Amino acid sequence: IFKPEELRQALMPTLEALYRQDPESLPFRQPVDPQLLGIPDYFDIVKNPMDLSTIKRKLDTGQYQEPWQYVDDVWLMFNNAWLYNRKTSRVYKFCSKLAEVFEQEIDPVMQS
Numbered sequence: 001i002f003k004p005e006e007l008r009q010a011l012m013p014t015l016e017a018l019y020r021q022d023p024e025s026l027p028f029r030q031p032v033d034p035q036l037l038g039i040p041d042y043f044d045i046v047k048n049p050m051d052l053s054t055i056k057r058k059l060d061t062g063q064y065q066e067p068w069q070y071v072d073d074v075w076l077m078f079n080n081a082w083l084y085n086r087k088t089s090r091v092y093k094f095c096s097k098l099a100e101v102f103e104q105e106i107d108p109v110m111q112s
C-alpha cells in the first residue's frame with residue numbers, strides 16, 4: 001500500500017529532473033503530434049505513446065498505485081523514442097540523456 005500523495009512527493013522530483021534538461025526534454029514535454037511533426041507513421045510504430053505531461057498528470061491525480069507503474073511509464077516513454085527514432089537522430093540522443101538522468105534519480109527513491 002502506497003498513499004498516492006506520498007508517491008507524488010517521492011516521485012515528482014525524478015520527473016522535475018527530466019523537465020530541467022533543456023533542450024533534451026523538449027521533444028518529450030507533450031504528446032507527439034504526428035501530423036504537426038510531419039511523421040505520419042508514428043502511431044503505426046508506437047502503439048502506446050507516453051510523454052512527460054501524461055506522466056505528470058497521472059502523478060498529480062493519483063493514477064499510480066505503486067512506484068513501478070511510474071517507472072514503467074517513464075521507461076515506456078524512453079523505449080518508444082528509441083524505437084521510433086534512428087540511433088543517429090537528435091531525439092534518440094536526447095532520449096539517451098534523459099534516461100541517464102532518470103536512472104540516477106530514480107535509484108535511491110525506489111530504495112525508500
Ligand SMILES: CCOc1ccc(C(C)=O)cc1NC(=O)c1cc(-c2cscn2)cc(-c2nn[nH]n2)c1
Pocket residue numbers: 023026027028030031032033037039080081084085091
Ligand atoms: C521532427 C521529429 O520530431 C520528433 C520526432 C520524434 C519524437 C519522439 C518523442 O519520438 C519527438 C519529436 N519532436 C518533438 O516532439 C518536438 C516537439 C516540440 C513541440 C511540440 S509543441 C511545441 N514544440 C518541440 C520540440 C523541440 N525540440 N527541440 N526544441 N523543440 C520537439
